[PDB]
Design an enzyme around this catalytic site. Structure first.
Site, mmCIF file in Angstrom:
data_model
loop_
_atom_site.group_PDB
_atom_site.id
_atom_site.type_symbol
_atom_site.label_atom_id
_atom_site.label_comp_id
_atom_site.label_asym_id
_atom_site.label_seq_id
_atom_site.Cartn_x
_atom_site.Cartn_y
_atom_site.Cartn_z
ATOM 1 N N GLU A 298 -6.429 -7.294 19.293
ATOM 2 C CA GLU A 298 -5.612 -7.660 20.404
ATOM 3 C C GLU A 298 -7.763 -6.871 21.188
ATOM 4 O O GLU A 298 -7.471 -5.454 20.860
ATOM 5 C CB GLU A 298 -5.097 -7.102 20.915
ATOM 6 C CG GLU A 298 -5.173 -7.213 22.975
ATOM 7 C CD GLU A 298 -4.958 -6.056 23.437
ATOM 8 O OE1 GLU A 298 -4.502 -4.979 23.109
ATOM 9 O OE2 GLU A 298 -6.191 -5.766 24.471
ATOM 10 N N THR B 41 0.003 -2.598 15.591
ATOM 11 C CA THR B 41 -1.550 -2.512 14.482
ATOM 12 C C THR B 41 -1.490 -0.959 14.188
ATOM 13 O O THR B 41 -1.702 -1.235 12.467
ATOM 14 C CB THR B 41 -2.115 -3.005 15.329
ATOM 15 O OG1 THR B 41 -1.942 -4.545 15.903
ATOM 16 C CG2 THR B 41 -3.398 -2.975 14.243
ATOM 17 N N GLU C 280 -11.968 17.845 -1.599
ATOM 18 C CA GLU C 280 -11.618 19.229 -1.255
ATOM 19 C C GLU C 280 -10.325 19.498 -0.224
ATOM 20 O O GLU C 280 -9.452 20.440 -0.297
ATOM 21 C CB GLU C 280 -13.241 19.943 -0.695
ATOM 22 C CG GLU C 280 -13.164 21.632 -1.425
ATOM 23 C CD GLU C 280 -14.042 22.492 -1.178
ATOM 24 O OE1 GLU C 280 -14.815 21.938 -0.624
ATOM 25 O OE2 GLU C 280 -14.013 23.871 -0.697
ATOM 26 N N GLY D 89 -5.516 -0.330 16.260
ATOM 27 C CA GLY D 89 -5.166 -0.163 17.254
ATOM 28 C C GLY D 89 -5.635 0.577 18.835
ATOM 29 O O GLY D 89 -6.676 0.856 18.221
ATOM 30 N N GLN D 90 -4.658 0.223 19.242
ATOM 31 C CA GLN D 90 -5.742 0.745 20.493
ATOM 32 C C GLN D 90 -4.899 2.707 20.481
ATOM 33 O O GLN D 90 -6.755 2.624 20.582
ATOM 34 C CB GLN D 90 -4.190 1.234 21.912
ATOM 35 C CG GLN D 90 -4.633 1.337 22.904
ATOM 36 C CD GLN D 90 -3.655 1.425 24.161
ATOM 37 O OE1 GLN D 90 -3.570 0.205 24.802
ATOM 38 N NE2 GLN D 90 -3.298 2.175 25.022
ATOM 39 N N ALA D 91 -4.398 3.306 20.154
ATOM 40 C CA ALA D 91 -4.474 4.888 19.808
ATOM 41 C C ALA D 91 -5.998 5.020 18.832
ATOM 42 O O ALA D 91 -6.405 6.164 19.000
ATOM 43 C CB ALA D 91 -3.567 5.825 19.181
ATOM 44 N N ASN E 179 2.005 13.552 20.323
ATOM 45 C CA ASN E 179 1.185 13.364 21.871
ATOM 46 C C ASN E 179 2.336 14.295 22.737
ATOM 47 O O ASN E 179 1.710 14.443 23.688
ATOM 48 C CB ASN E 179 1.537 11.879 22.326
ATOM 49 C CG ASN E 179 0.246 11.146 21.971
ATOM 50 O OD1 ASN E 179 -0.174 11.390 21.455
ATOM 51 N ND2 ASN E 179 0.639 10.063 22.232
ATOM 52 N N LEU F 228 -14.351 15.161 0.640
ATOM 53 C CA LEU F 228 -12.228 14.974 1.348
ATOM 54 C C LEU F 228 -12.021 15.701 -0.442
ATOM 55 O O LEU F 228 -10.848 15.288 1.110
ATOM 56 C CB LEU F 228 -12.683 12.868 1.109
ATOM 57 C CG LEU F 228 -13.351 12.819 2.181
ATOM 58 C CD1 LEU F 228 -13.302 11.120 2.348
ATOM 59 C CD2 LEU F 228 -12.435 13.455 3.709
HETATM 60 N N1 LIG Z 1 -3.109 10.242 21.778
HETATM 61 C C1 LIG Z 1 -2.546 9.319 22.178
HETATM 62 N N2 LIG Z 1 -1.746 8.445 22.059
HETATM 63 C C2 LIG Z 1 -2.048 6.786 22.198
HETATM 64 C C3 LIG Z 1 -2.961 6.574 22.624
HETATM 65 N N3 LIG Z 1 -3.407 5.176 23.542
HETATM 66 C C4 LIG Z 1 -2.021 4.707 23.083
HETATM 67 N N4 LIG Z 1 -1.149 5.011 21.917
HETATM 68 C C5 LIG Z 1 0.217 5.976 21.837
HETATM 69 O O1 LIG Z 1 0.555 4.902 20.731
HETATM 70 C C6 LIG Z 1 1.892 4.520 20.879
HETATM 71 C C7 LIG Z 1 1.541 2.901 20.995
HETATM 72 O O2 LIG Z 1 0.626 2.366 20.060
HETATM 73 P P1 LIG Z 1 -0.466 1.624 20.183
HETATM 74 O O3 LIG Z 1 -1.501 2.514 19.625
HETATM 75 O O4 LIG Z 1 -1.245 1.294 21.670
HETATM 76 O O5 LIG Z 1 -0.706 0.079 19.812
HETATM 77 P P2 LIG Z 1 -1.235 -0.475 18.417
HETATM 78 O O6 LIG Z 1 -1.900 0.355 18.059
HETATM 79 O O7 LIG Z 1 -2.919 -1.145 19.443
HETATM 80 O O8 LIG Z 1 -0.297 -1.884 18.236
HETATM 81 P P3 LIG Z 1 0.058 -3.076 19.374
HETATM 82 O O9 LIG Z 1 -0.525 -3.138 20.304
HETATM 83 O O10 LIG Z 1 1.309 -3.113 18.575
HETATM 84 O O11 LIG Z 1 -0.510 -4.434 18.762
HETATM 85 C C8 LIG Z 1 2.041 5.249 21.893
HETATM 86 O O12 LIG Z 1 3.274 5.921 20.830
HETATM 87 C C9 LIG Z 1 1.141 5.128 22.458
HETATM 88 O O13 LIG Z 1 1.439 6.903 23.758
HETATM 89 C C10 LIG Z 1 -4.107 7.376 23.171
HETATM 90 O O14 LIG Z 1 -5.463 6.418 23.743
HETATM 91 N N5 LIG Z 1 -4.333 8.486 22.527
HETATM 92 MG MG LIG Z 2 -2.617 -2.550 21.407
#
Ligand SMILES: Nc1nc2c(ncn2[C@@H]2O[C@H](COP(=O)(O)OP(=O)(O)OP(=O)(O)O)[C@@H](O)[C@H]2O)c(=O)[nH]1
Ligand SMILES: [Mg+2]
Ligand SMILES: Nc1ncnc2c1ncn2[C@@H]1O[C@H](COP(=O)(O)OP(=O)(O)CP(=O)(O)O)[C@@H](O)[C@H]1O
Ligand SMILES: Nc1nc2c(ncn2[C@@H]2O[C@H](COP(=O)(O)OP(=O)(O)O)[C@@H](O)[C@H]2O)c(=O)[nH]1
Ligand SMILES: CCCCc1ccc2[nH]c(NC(=O)OC)nc2c1
Ligand SMILES: [Ca+2]
Ligand SMILES: [Mg+2]
Ligand SMILES: [Mg+2]
Lengths: 426, 338, 54, 438
Positions: D71, D145, D254, D10-12, D206, D252
């Site tokens: 995505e 995701t 440990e 996922g993005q995060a 966060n 791991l």
């Molecule tokens: N610390 C941190 N949090 C993030 C980041 N990107 C998104 N988040 C957090 O993650 C949550 C959103 O989920 P995402 O990771 O963006 O979504 P994803 O896993 O890509 O899933 P979808 O986009 O729904 O397909 C929110 O709480 C955001 O604030 C990042 O780069 N760093």
């Molecule tokens: Mg996403």
């Protein structure tokens, strides 16, 4: 990525045209279709709404629908009229006579497959179609009756795509014919079933704003559409420019719609401007105005209901720390009108690029149970005629039965009860 | 304009504090479970400290110190005193006390008999209304079957006229900066029955609770309204009768005790660098013996005030504890310094 | 306070300090549930498509 | 030597993945193209950094990393950024259309069509491993995701790699930096279905990172870039023992034996000090005692909670820089006298300490100043259950009205998974309460 846009009828095509003017200017596209802008941020999401065409011109992913040729010939003659793909003009000859039955069942049915062929041709060129948006009024015949027939057929052919509408709601203050409550009530049930988001643009509110607030003595439809194009620009800023969030139509619907039938939004805009001021708004001013009843385009009092969800999009160069504090100020100041069982239901985004002619602006999208006031109003006008079967012959003459009106009226009152259930909840 | 929530409807003190806050016109009351509050006047039991201080843009304050119950329940107070070096096992002002479950039971009886073979008084009380005093160890150990057993103070200071027993209740507010504020007006809860060293199971003479005296005792309201003597009368008595003052003979010890109890638990409960903040109002109960020595009985975490003093104390809770945090548009407290 | 199991190397050291002593589903089960959800999703779409057919 | 595969979801997960691998490169002297001049064993190696990097015959050092998003936007910035060359194209997997913040869409609808592809690109990395330890899995709780696909991935990794360890770094949702509203749903759903598949999970709220960024770095409104560079400093201090010579937390397994005695309670609290702004003109460097003392201030934790009102099951101090054991023990002694540190009765009161003499690496042009010594404390305290209490309460408020539930049912989830997940969390909250309060 791609959104496919559809405009149906007189109202649908007139606001649809102004929408493409406004955002085409925001992305630097001229009536030629030529990009003549300065920042590459204008082009980074140009594909959401435009196809890249022969000669690397940009051609709106727009389909233009009417049952009479009048308004569409005047679009082709309008400012940006040449920008549209000529194949995407789909018109009949006979009109709909402000008659939902003609739009939905007789004249419109004749034309609808033709429209879906164009929709299909535009979708097939889509890397990953997010969904559709429709501009239309609910008060006439084509945008209301054929528009909702179109939406049903699109849902049949693409049941997993988002359908959003910008739906102009009729009002006796801005009124073409007496049968508008009939057409609107029949349409609202179609919308309840087959739409993911509907922006309820009330012609009452647009009129009042132009009159009471922009001090326009006799507002025209152009006065009203200026507010609508400015609001549609703001509602879609999210999708057209690179910002903090990367949310498609589905993700936006996911965070605005807690219950599938309650997807009718009250839009708002700040600052409110007439066609022709230089003092920019402070962030406290943007915030206060966008929550003010007088900036709402759906003539409902938000203090008469509760917010299920709110989104807001600030445009321009500004302090998001100051946005954060003002947003949190107006909630924590008035937490009595937000539901307590959806935590953190007010969400905010900033976009650096402001609209034409303002250095600062704010678009409001409220999912409030107060929207029930709009549907009660239409329902009272509906039954005032319906209990005498007044003007029904226009509809029975096209094959409709009174029972279909009884069902539509009763669906509308159910929708109203649903909203009232959550205005009293916890 | 500030916001607050009320999650304990049966608190005399904060009922009045809520009404004072509204009357300032700058405080608005929300419903029980709305989380967008500035101030929480919380439940006595299972207060959700883990949910506080996580609302962005809201300073949040609560009227309870998480962890202060260790001071304010009988068994934990004894464990806190005997095991904390700041309040040694050798602690001059707490009665010798023992934690016995239905553990130190064997440890306790070694104390009984060295006194019993030592020719000293051996009257003890058992505590946790289910409260029993006697010189039989068998008596109360029998009856217990967690509780606390501590030496009964066999020579209390007795007021005249009446030859009657009493205890002192002091109200102490600890603010979010851990300033310790003693309210200048205490109250003395008296018995109206005279005192008798033989009939211990005539306990309406031996337990000075305001409840017992009002409808379980013969001569209630005889000497003073309420069986409540305030500090000006008690002071005059000590001047007229004993040639001293309340300040010298008793209050010095009371302040020393309050400060030492609260300074001890400060590292465990302080909210100085926490994401939410606490204040709390305590009620300290003292026994005074006939040598004008003060003894701590027990600390109350959710106390009620005396009816004459509600107005002044609750107004001082707003000023020192609440508006110190949330400002608006001589003091009745003694600051105990550390 | 006893220092225990000290190990040294050229990048650093480790040790313990003590202050006080003490007083799954199968592949088939997964693909079953991934296919149950898909047929619930195909049934709900058939309901919509029949509704659109009426 | 035993290899470790990092999975970013996922993005995060992806953006934190990038922040860490950037840092890893700066720490090990690996350049953006993948070359490491200090590695004299060309084309191979038994070294400690090889647990995270493979070597090509051309001398190129390549992360044992797979990136997966439903995505393409975010992984496309990996594909075109400073570290293009680092990664094999086959390690960057993108879908077409994301999970829309919908756990069900990430787990069932969109996840089912891509799980086999991901497992196959993971298996290709595992096949270059002489002795694979297991996996480090990076993801958000709140994303569709990050929550939905991750839990499906974790389930399959347990069947395909049954005796391997799996560690998580999980971003817990904060409203201040999120535009979603259903994140409590996703978090509970992904925690319930992942619990028995994860041996050890480091949660990062966060909210805590945001406030550390504001208070200690004087950033008025932190971005994800600010958040992630700080996060990757913490992760790096947590994984440094897997990538450097030493004797603590060396595999791991440990992590679990040192930090997780009771396997459901596998959420250690991380606390990090010091965080110092790079634009602070004059900084007086902090001693061993000051930075170790700072490990007991809630304002420096990855999850804001109060450890004084809980009990510890384990505690580990990981120092980087100018630190010697004598100064650690002197700091610990003064700290036990002044702090409320209470262990459970069935565990020794004590600290496992690891020291690495190399001080923290900082990203050039980041917000973090260089410091002569830093510490990351990993403590398994029951106080972290406060974060489960917060999230569960938010879940209860929405679910009582079935708000947004239709979005999940419409992707094939049944309503009853909501309540089964919520009751697992109720079990978890009471496990913590048993272990940690009297
Ligand atoms: N610390 C941190 N949090 C993030 C980041 N990107 C998104 N988040 C957090 O993650 C949550 C959103 O989920 P995402 O990771 O963006 O979504 P994803 O896993 O890509 O899933 P979808 O986009 O729904 O397909 C929110 O709480 C955001 O604030 C990042 O780069 N760093
Ligand atoms: Mg996403
Ligand atoms: N060790 C002792 N020696 C002599 N008298 C004692 C004593 N312990 C208690 N008492 C008497 O017993 C009474 C009640 O004791 P205790 O403090 O346990 O009750 P309580 O919890 O109800 C007071 P509060 O209402 O302030 O909480 C006191 O008012 C005091 O008179
Ligand atoms: N705001 C706005 N409302 C319009 C416009 N044109 C028509 N309407 C309203 O739309 C309704 C009539 O619908 P219309 O579009 O003319 O009918 P159609 O062409 O058959 O779809 C009435 O409520 C009119 O007030 C317009 O340009 N702007
Ligand atoms: C974080 C703030 C989110 C703002 C927001 C929220 C919901 C939306 N839904 C649409 N739909 C649309 O533009 O249809 C063409 N736009 C939206 C913008
Ligand atoms: Ca090598
Ligand atoms: Mg018309
Ligand atoms: Mg009591």
């Amino acid at each position: 990525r791609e959104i496919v846009h559809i405009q149906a009828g007189q109202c649908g095509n007139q606001i649809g045209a102004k929408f493409w003017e406004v955002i085409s200017d925001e992305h630097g596209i001229d009536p030629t279709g030529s990009y003549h802008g300065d920042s590459d941020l204008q082009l980074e999401r140009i594909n959401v709404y435009y196809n890249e065409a022969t000669g690397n011109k940009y051609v709106p992913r727009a389909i233009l629908v009417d049952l009479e040729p009048g308004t569409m010939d005047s679009v082709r003659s309008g400012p940006f009229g040449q920008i549209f793909r000529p194949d995407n003009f789909v018109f009949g000859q006979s009109g709909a006579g402000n008659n939902w039955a003609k739009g939905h069942y007789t004249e419109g049915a004749e034309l609808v497959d033709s429209v879906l062929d164009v929709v299909r041709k535009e979708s097939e060129s889509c890397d990953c179609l997010q969904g559709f948006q429709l501009t239309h009024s609910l008060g006439g015949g084509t945008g209301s009756g054929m528009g909702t027939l179109l939406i049903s057929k699109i849902r049949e052919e693409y049941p997993d795509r988002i359908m959003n509408t910008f739906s102009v709601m009729p009002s006796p203050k801005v009124s073409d014919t007496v049968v508008e409550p009939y057409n609107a009530t029949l349409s609202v049930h179609q919308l309840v079933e087959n739409t993911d988001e509907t922006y309820c643009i009330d012609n009452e509110a647009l009129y009042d704003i132009c009159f009471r607030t922009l001090k326009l003595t006799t507002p025209t439809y152009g006065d009203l559409n200026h507010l609508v194009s400015a609001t549609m620009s703001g509602v879609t800023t999210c999708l057209r420019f690179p910002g903090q969030l990367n949310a498609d139509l589905r993700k936006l619907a996911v965070n605005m719609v807690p219950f599938p039938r309650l997807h009718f939004f009250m839009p708002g805009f700040a600052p409110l401007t007439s066609r022709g001021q230089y003092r920019a708004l402070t962030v406290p001013e943007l915030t206060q105005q966008m929550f003010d009843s007088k900036n709402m385009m759906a003539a409902c009092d938000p203090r008469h209901g509760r917010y299920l969800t709110v989104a807001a999009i600030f445009r321009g160069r500004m302090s998001m720390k100051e946005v954060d504090e003002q947003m949190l100020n107006v909630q924590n100041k008035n937490s009595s009108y937000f539901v307590e069982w959806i935590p953190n239901n007010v969400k905010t985004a900033v976009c650096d690029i402001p609209p034409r002619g303002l250095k600062m602006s704010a678009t409001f999208i409220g999912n409030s149970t107060a929207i029930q006031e709009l549907f009660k109003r239409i329902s009272e006008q509906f039954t005032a005629m319906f209990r005498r079967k007044a003007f029904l012959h226009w509809y029975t003459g096209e094959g409709m039965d009174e029972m279909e009106f009884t069902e539509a009226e009763s669906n509308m009152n159910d929708l109203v009860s649903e909203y009232q259930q959550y205005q009293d909840a916890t | 304009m500030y916001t607050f929530v009320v999650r304990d409807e049966n608190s005399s003190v904060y009922a009045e504090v809520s009404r004072l806050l509204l009357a300032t016109g700058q405080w608005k009351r929300l419903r029980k479970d709305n989380p967008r509050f500035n101030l929480m006047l919380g439940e006595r039991n299972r207060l959700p400290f883990g949910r506080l201080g996580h609302e962005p843009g809201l300073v949040q304050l609560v009227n309870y110190y998480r962890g202060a119950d260790k001071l304010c329940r009988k068994a934990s107070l004894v464990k806190l005193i005997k095991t904390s070096p700041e309040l040694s096992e050798s602690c001059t002002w707490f009665p010798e006390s023992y934690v016995i479950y239905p553990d130190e039971r064997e440890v306790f009886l070694a104390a009984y008999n060295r006194r019993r073979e030592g020719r000293e008084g051996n009257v003890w009380i058992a505590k946790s209304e289910g409260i029993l005093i006697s010189s039989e160890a068998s008596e109360l150990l029998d009856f217990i079957d967690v509780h606390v057993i501590q030496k009964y103070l066999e020579k209390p200071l007795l007021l005249e006229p009446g030859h009657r027993k009493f205890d002192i209740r002091s109200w102490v507010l600890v603010d979010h900066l851990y300033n310790i504020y003693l309210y200048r007006e205490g109250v003395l809860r008296t018995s109206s029955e005279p005192y008798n060293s033989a009939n211990f199971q005539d306990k309406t003479c031996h337990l000075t609770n305001h409840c017992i005296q009002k409808e379980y005792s013969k001569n209630y309201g005889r000497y003073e309204e309420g069986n409540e003597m305030f500090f000006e009368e008690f002071n005059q008595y000590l001047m007229d009768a004993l040639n001293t003052t309340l300040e010298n003979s008793i209050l010095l010890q009371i302040k020393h005790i309050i400060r030492s109890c609260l300074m001890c638990i400060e590292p465990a409960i302080s909210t100085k660098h926490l994401h939410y903040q606490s204040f709390q109002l305590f009620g300290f109960d003292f026994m005074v013996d006939e040598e004008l020595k003060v003894w701590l009985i027990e600390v109350n975490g959710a106390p009620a005030c005396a009816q004459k003093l509600y107005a002044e104390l609750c107004q001082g809770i707003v000023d020192v504890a609440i508006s110190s945090v949330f400002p608006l548009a001589t003091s009745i407290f003694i600051k105990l310094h550390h | 306070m006893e220092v225990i199991e000290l190990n040294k190397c050229t990048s650093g050291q480790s040790f313990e300090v003590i202050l006080k002593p003490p007083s799954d589903p199968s592949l088939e089960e997964i693909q079953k549930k991934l296919e149950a959800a898909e047929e619930r999703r195909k049934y709900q779409e058939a309901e919509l498509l029949k509704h659109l057919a009426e | 030597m035993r290899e470790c595969i990092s999975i970013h979801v996922g993005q995060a997960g992806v953006q934190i993945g990038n922040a860490c691998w950037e840092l890893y490169c700066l720490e090990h002297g690996i350049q953006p193209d993948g070359q490491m001049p200090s590695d004299k064993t060309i084309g191979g190696g038994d070294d400690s950094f090889n647990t995270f990097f493979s070597e090509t015959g051309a001398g190129k050092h390549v992360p044992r990393a797979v990136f997966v998003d439903l995505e393409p936007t975010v992984i496309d910035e990996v594909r075109t950024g400073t570290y293009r060359q680092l990664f094999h194209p086959e390690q960057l997997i993108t879908g077409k259309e994301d999970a829309a913040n919908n756990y069900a869409r990430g787990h069932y609808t969109i996840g089912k069509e891509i799980i086999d592809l991901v497992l196959d690109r993971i298996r290709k990395l595992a096949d270059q491993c002489t002795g694979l330890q297991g996996f480090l899995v990076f993801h958000s709780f709140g994303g569709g995701t990050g929550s939905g696909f991750t839990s499906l991935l974790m389930e399959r990794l347990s069947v395909d790699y049954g005796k391997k360890s799996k560690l998580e770094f999980s971003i817990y949702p904060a409203p201040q930096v999120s535009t979603a509203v259903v994140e409590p749903y996703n978090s509970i759903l992904t925690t319930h279905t992942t619990l028995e598949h994860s041996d050890c999970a480091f949660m990062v709220d966060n909210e805590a990172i945001y406030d550390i960024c504001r208070r200690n770095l004087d950033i008025e409104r932190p971005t994800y870039t600010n958040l992630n560079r700080l996060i990757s400093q913490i992760v790096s201090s947590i994984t440094a023992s897997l990538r450097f010579d030493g004797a603590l937390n060396v595999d791991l397994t440990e992590f679990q034996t040192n930090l997780v005695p009771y396997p459901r309670i596998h959420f250690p609290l991380a606390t990090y000090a010091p965080v110092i702004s790079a634009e602070k003109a004059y900084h007086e460097q902090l001693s061993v005692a000051e930075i170790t003392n700072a490990c007991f201030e809630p304002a420096n934790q990855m999850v804001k909670c109060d450890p004084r009102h809980g009990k510890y099951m384990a505690c580990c101090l990981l120092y980087r820089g100018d630190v010697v054991p004598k100064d650690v023990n002197a700091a610990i002694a003064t700290i036990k006298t002044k702090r409320s540190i209470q262990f459970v009765d069935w565990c020794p009161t004590g600290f496992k300490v690891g020291i690495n003499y190399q001080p923290p690496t900082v990203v050039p042009g980041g917000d973090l100043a260089k410091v002569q010594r830093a510490v990351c404390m990993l403590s398994n305290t029951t106080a972290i259950a406060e974060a489960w209490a917060r999230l569960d309460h938010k879940f209860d408020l929405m679910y009582a009205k079935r708000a947004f539930v239709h979005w999940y049912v419409g992707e094939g989830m049944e309503e009853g998974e909501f309540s089964e997940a919520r009751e697992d969390m109720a079990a978890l909250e009471k496990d913590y309460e048993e272990v940690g309060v009297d």
